Amino acid sequence: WXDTGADXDGXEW
Ligand SMILES: *C(=O)CCCCCCCCC
């Protein structure tokens, strides 16, 4: 996906 913590459309990672 891409993210890490706060924020997104599900989290975590
Ligand atoms: C989230 O990004 C997990 C999937 C791995 C990245 C795929 C992006 C396109 C690959 C060329």
> Could you tell me if the CB of 12 is within 6 A of ligand 1?
no
Cα gap 6→11, rounded to integer Å: 7
Technique that determined the structure: NMR
CA 8-12-13 angle, to 5 degrees, is: 105
Alpha carbon of 1 to ligand 1 centroid (Å): 6
Give phi and psi for 6, each to the nearest 5. -15, 105
Cα gap 5→1, rounded to integer Å: 12
Residues sharing a CB contact under 8 Å with residue 4, sequence separation 6 or more, in sequence order: 13
Token couple for 10: 């599900």
Cα gap 10→4, rounded to integer Å: 11
* DSSP structure class, residue 6: S
> Could you tell me if the CB of 1 is within 6 A of ligand 1?
yes
Say which residue the tokens 């891409």 belong to: 2
Token couple for 2: 């891409």
- Nearest residue CA, atom 5 of ligand 1? 1
Q: 11, 1 in Cβ contact below 8 A?
A: no
